[PDB]
Symmetry: D2
Subunit: 387 residues, 4 copies
Amino acid sequence: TPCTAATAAVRAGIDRDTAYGAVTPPIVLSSNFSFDGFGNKRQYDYTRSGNPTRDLLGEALAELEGGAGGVITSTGMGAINLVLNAVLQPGDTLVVPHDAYGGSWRLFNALAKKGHFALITADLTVPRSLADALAQSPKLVLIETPSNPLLRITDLRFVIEAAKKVGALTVVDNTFLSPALQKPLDFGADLVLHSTTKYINGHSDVVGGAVVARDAELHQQLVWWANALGLTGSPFDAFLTLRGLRTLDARLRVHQENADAIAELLDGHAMVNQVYFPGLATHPGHALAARQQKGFGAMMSFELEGGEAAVRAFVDGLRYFTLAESLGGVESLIAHPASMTHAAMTAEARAAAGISDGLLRLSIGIESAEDLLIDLRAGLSRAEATL
Amino acid sequence: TPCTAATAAVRAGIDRDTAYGAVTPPIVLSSNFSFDGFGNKRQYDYTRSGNPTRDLLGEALAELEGGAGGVITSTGMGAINLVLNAVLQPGDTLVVPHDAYGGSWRLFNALAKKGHFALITADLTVPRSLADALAQSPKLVLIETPSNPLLRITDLRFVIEAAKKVGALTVVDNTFLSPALQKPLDFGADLVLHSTTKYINGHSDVVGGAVVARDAELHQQLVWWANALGLTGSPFDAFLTLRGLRTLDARLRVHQENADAIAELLDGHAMVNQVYFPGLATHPGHALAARQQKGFGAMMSFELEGGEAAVRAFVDGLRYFTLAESLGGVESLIAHPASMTHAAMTAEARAAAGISDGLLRLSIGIESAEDLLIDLRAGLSRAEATLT
Amino acid sequence: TPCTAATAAVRAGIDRDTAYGAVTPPIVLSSNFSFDGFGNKRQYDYTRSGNPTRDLLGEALAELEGGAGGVITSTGMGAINLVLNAVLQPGDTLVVPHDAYGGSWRLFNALAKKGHFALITADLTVPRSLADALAQSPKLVLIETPSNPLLRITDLRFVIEAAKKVGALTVVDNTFLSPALQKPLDFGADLVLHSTTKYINGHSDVVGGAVVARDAELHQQLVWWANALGLTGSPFDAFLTLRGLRTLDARLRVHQENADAIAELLDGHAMVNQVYFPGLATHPGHALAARQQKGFGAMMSFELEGGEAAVRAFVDGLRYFTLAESLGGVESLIAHPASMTHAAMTAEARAAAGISDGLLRLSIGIESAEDLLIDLRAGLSRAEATL
Amino acid sequence: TPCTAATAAVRAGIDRDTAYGAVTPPIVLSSNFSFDGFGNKRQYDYTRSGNPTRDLLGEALAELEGGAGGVITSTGMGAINLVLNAVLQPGDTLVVPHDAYGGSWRLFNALAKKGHFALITADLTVPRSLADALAQSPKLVLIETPSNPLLRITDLRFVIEAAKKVGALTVVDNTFLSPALQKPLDFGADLVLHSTTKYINGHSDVVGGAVVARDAELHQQLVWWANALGLTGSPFDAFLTLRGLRTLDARLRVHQENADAIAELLDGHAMVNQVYFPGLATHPGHALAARQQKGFGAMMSFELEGGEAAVRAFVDGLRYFTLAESLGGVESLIAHPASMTHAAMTAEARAAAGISDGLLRLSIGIESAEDLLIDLRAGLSRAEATL
Ligand SMILES: C=C(/N=C/c1c(COP(=O)(O)O)cnc(C)c1O)C(=O)O
Ligand SMILES: C=C(/N=C/c1c(COP(=O)(O)O)cnc(C)c1O)C(=O)O
Ligand SMILES: C=C(/N=C/c1c(COP(=O)(O)O)cnc(C)c1O)C(=O)O
Ligand SMILES: C=C(/N=C/c1c(COP(=O)(O)O)cnc(C)c1O)C(=O)O
């Protein structure tokens, strides 16, 4: 037998210390490693290039995604940066989703303005938009599913096959669901990447990124570029992220229980005009999400009746949703993306992506369902009091 | 509403930084804190006495246990040490369980031999033994329930009310269930203590202890003695412990699911002579555990058929049970207490406790139930193969 | 050759990782260590008993002090507590100095009141007071030299041979000079202990203690008691402490240069009644300090002219001396012991020690001498403007 | 009065904690920061963009270099990467030294093959080579002085002034000497950058980078690019780096004492054909180094008589020089750059740089001079025994 993915995450680096037989893996902060006498480099020589603590996390995420190996970067934006430098040169074309993370948008646009590559932004959910983008022979197609923050679902099998047919590489940003809820490489993707800052770490105390390649040769290119650009992460951050990873399965059971209870409260509630949550049969992408995901996750957004005055009364008084950026932590978060997560975009790359200004996004934590539901009811009720 | 235990643990550090509004609490490593000009101590002056990162952990554990406050120590034994120094003096008698952690037994015996207090070692599950011990007007009674490593259950209401009748204080070692699954202060205990090393931290990468007192004045005496003896913990360890605390609920759901499945495999298996697990209806104390606990936990022990040869074959080959000391980690562990956790005890204190030389203890992790059961069945075949 | 103290501190734990040859030693946070199959304990089993990261610090402090081994505790008071528990029992007498750290006084008095041992507090600088204390056949004598906060020197050779004549063990609190500047075991002490919180760590970001025994058997007993009472320290703290240790020599060079300059400013300044600093030729014990120490260190205290108003004006406005407890940090500190470090003493135990209510203690850091002298001169003017 | 640079390094973040008055600054690991109610972003919102612990280090290095601000990256290579992205686009040309760090060479040459900018590789110590490079209207000139590993000195005033006359920006890599021994912005440079991995950290347990801009507007561009590319560093690493910085002055006093004693042993010793150390009057660049540096540092390389067999007998037996990459730590290191630090280059971008195969580089630590001298003497004897 191999073990399950939950067993492998819990046991990553457990009882793998040759020095002392430590159960928990030691933190190797060391910048440098001795040679074994003249001309004899050990497995490791310099932490920017390779570090064993970082490589445990690399190997664990590669085993979870079904990849040949993993590279750990200082940030999730760094992992995207690494893929752009490893794969694209000027004259190559990149296809990206129209509703990708605002930070992804900012980076694609600033590097396209300089001429590092040509950029096509398409709606990958619309066959016409996709086939128009693939007709232009792109080197690389980026998929982000589900999308942040309207939870649009992209058909992995479909887009990946359409991209193979024209000779394009595919990279999927799998941050929103993590490896425990979606395995893009199962559907033939070349590359999967994460902001480990979110669910993989789970404790809102590490900014980090990962890239896992299906193929050994593309993994070796990512290792080379990560070292040459200096994008590699801190061993201390890898140590906390690996510790975080050990509870990813346990955490997501509670996240998903809470999210199912909260989607049921928000959907058809008098003060809520629209819920974006792939778990609702009415959500465009529900059946796709039910098929290509092991679960519907714990990210959702919703449009509150009553414009800005209603949002303000909803938000001001929350005891258990902290008004902050980021997502995927044990603690429940709320955000208003126009102003907050999506402020990097122009006011009509925002309207083109369909991100309103009366929209709230919830990152549902692992608190008691009943406490979060009391917290949301009190807010809905403060929003009602403003009509 | 106040919130649930799960919410309290999850939200323990959160949005509590006045400097920057950091969601996750900053690590205050600082040994010292400035005065606010001449003669003006701030809230904190010196980390041995008081540290804000350590106090977030003390507060969270006090809220979970229902106490007035918490003191965080460098180890679980140090928490026991703190209580013995704050409460006892020469001429006092301490009652302890016969079947307590071997490390507990080692400290009780070493300090009694010096004359710090008189020691009575009683079976607090037998009303006769309890009543003989309380007859001698003890200053303090220590309860450890469930007991390590035979999972004997002591009746908190019964023992605590009998101890109060003779004006004894009570302290409960709640390590094996954590505050999420047993609240001894709800039964009238003066003190609850923990090795945070186990379930509260959950990641096997901190040694630590905690003591929560029901009453503010006793809490203040523990603060004083912890400061004076220098038993307080590292701010960094309290950071990691608080981080682990946040997943206590989510971890215990999987631990208990896995332990229910493994108990079902071992109970009545032909290769298993006895299983000790409070969740089994045939376990002495089952009905007690169901009423005083919110769950049956994920510690259990069992005795194989086939003596030492069966034990050796079972253990050598386990893929998902690391042979090691400790418990309460996300990673599954197996111990042989005779030769490991209880080796500090004499052969006769072990015989008196009923810790046999064929006893195996499981700390059941949060790996996939399907994998833990495959690993155990293959161990059980390895043991069976040794009967011929 | 074996190497010097400076080489030993710098190189503690360097190239000592068998797993990867990391130059800097890995942090073994692990609570537990696997057995090597049934019945086979490895070197380590459980971090409370024994941890390799903690033991690198123990080993380094034992090499530096000349001892058989070292035990690392959670705090300095915990090292004192460990010694009291390992060595004494009821009916034993302990001799302590009259002018020890207030925290030591607090613990000695609290445990004597319970009856763990009988307590004699003696002036170990006065042969009369010493000989009256040793006439009573004590089990243990504690020496603290130089003393906190009046820098009284006790004659290690004198007090230790007198104690041995009556079969008493001796323990020296060597916190104020560190092993780099005084080696009490070279004078025949049984035990030396430290608050590592001070010069050994040097960065004010760890509370810790250490006890080094000359004799292997007494070391094994301290190991046993530290394990059994749970007084051992955190592996992470031991890592930071070892990192700090590596600059102990380089830091003391600057501390002592700065202290020599500040002593020359304060000694005979119109605003200064008394300076207590062993490097001054007029300090009782100067000649003793020059023979039993490798340097005069960087702790000093002094008494201003002008009573309380002068103290308040001097202290308000200091730019480079933080008013705070502790000492031995790279950052310069000022304390008023009456109301801070020695507030745990009775007004009468303080009077008996000659700790006045107008006494200021400097812990001199490694800032530029020129800046510390500018700051102190401006304080001395603020105090003068007050007469 | 401002304080000195040593005072400012020692006291960076000391007593600057509004929460508790902590002397030592608290580690802010948090990925995210709450809003102060709806629409009220605090100073910080997301660690990839800004983090107060990282900013203490930024601000400390900006104060030491005399710049408007500092950006802290995950690696030193990342700091160079950041500068290339913030300053250059296709069609811009970059001038770099011929003998720049091997990893710098690797990054410039890979990004130039893709067409991100045009590369001119010049000898900045030769007027003709420089004026030919500057005649091509370059956007950016990079200076690395002293050079790694032959310690070539480039004239900061001369190259910076010549680069301004043609409208070029200058960036200096000041890794080898640190801000305590060289301030390139004092001579009018636009940018100074470091691998904090080396002397600034000083304890071989952090890989990191820094960039300090003279001008506020160029600093704000580096902040924007560091966030967008995800090149920013971990707060834990910033915390250790800041702790390291506090002993930079104290450490370099001992480093420089030791390097002076070792240069005297090696220079004209029978087994040493050449020493490269700017402290020697015979070294090309000695007088320049005496003028533009506060000290000669503690990096040196040397050519051993007797080819590969001599190098091997020298290296195998060293007790106090660890055979390893990196430099700037408290612990003494030796490297053979052809095979080790400079293997990133082709065998004849190296002959062009003048890096031979009988060449050892020393990173001289802060151990006792006498232990290092005994160690080097014994190695010279083993090398002698091979003729
Ligand atoms: C900060 C957020 N997201 C980060 C993110 C990133 C960037 O990762 P870092 O923030 O770790 O650079 C990449 N991809 C996706 C889908 C992401 O959501 C947020 O939406 O609040
Ligand atoms: C090491 C073990 N137990 C520790 C322990 C302790 C002591 O805690 P520390 O190991 O954290 O000092 C206290 N109470 C109970 C019930 C315990 O089980 C064990 O049985 O594996
Ligand atoms: C807090 C101080 N000293 C502590 C100390 C201690 C106690 O160490 P900890 O604070 O690390 O427990 C022991 N011995 C001496 C001579 C000491 O000065 C001080 O005087 O500021
Ligand atoms: C690894 C080495 N140097 C790194 C370095 C770097 C790159 O820094 P990181 O290794 O921190 O990426 C940049 N600039 C200079 C002058 C450098 O020496 C070495 O020479 O061994």
